Amino acid sequence: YEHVTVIPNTVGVPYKTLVNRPGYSPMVLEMELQSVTLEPTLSLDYITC
Amino acid sequence: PSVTDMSCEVPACTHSSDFGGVAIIKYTASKKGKCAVHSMTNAVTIREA
């Protein structure tokens, strides 16, 4: 069963979502975001001293 | 045996090729015994005899 959600980019706040499938009892999920990291690509040119 | 009061509720239905329906019926019976069941329509078939 496919379920799609959107969560804002806030660290340290829980969010909840409801899953509903006909014929079955509803289910609730809870998610929390702990960290996000960005990493650039670098190339060296020259050094000084 | 005789039955004097009955009611019906239907918590789920999916009209698939298989037995996808369930119903619950309440009854009051005058004494212990066995009883047969039968449907009064052509569009609905019941498994239990």
Curated annotation (Swiss-Prot), chain A:
PTM per Swiss-Prot/TrEMBL: N-glycosylated.
Superkingdom of source: Viruses
Topology relative to the membrane: Single-pass type I membrane protein
Coiled coil location: none
Cellular location(s): Virion membrane; Host cell membrane
Entry function: Class II viral fusion protein. Fusion activity is inactive as long as E1 is bound to E2 in mature virion. After virus attachment to target cell via host MXRA8 and endocytosis, acidification of the endosome induce dissociation of E1/E2 heterodimer and concomitant trimerization of the E1 subunits. This E1 trimer is fusion active, and promotes release of viral nucleocapsid in cytoplasm after endosome and viral membrane fusion. Efficient fusion requires the presence of cholesterol and sphingolipid in the target membrane.
Assembly: Interacts with spike glycoprotein E2. The precursor of protein E3/E2 and E1 form a heterodimer shortly after synthesis. Processing of the precursor of protein E3/E2 into E2 and E3 results in a heterodimer of the spike glycoproteins E2 and E1. Spike at virion surface are constituted of three E2-E1 heterodimers. After target cell attachment and endocytosis, E1 change conformation to form homotrimers. Interacts with 6K protein. Interacts with host MXRA8; this interaction mediates virus entry. The interaction involves 2 adjacent E2-E1 heterodimers.
Record protein name field: Spike glycoprotein E1
Part of the full-length chain shown: 810 to 858 of 1248
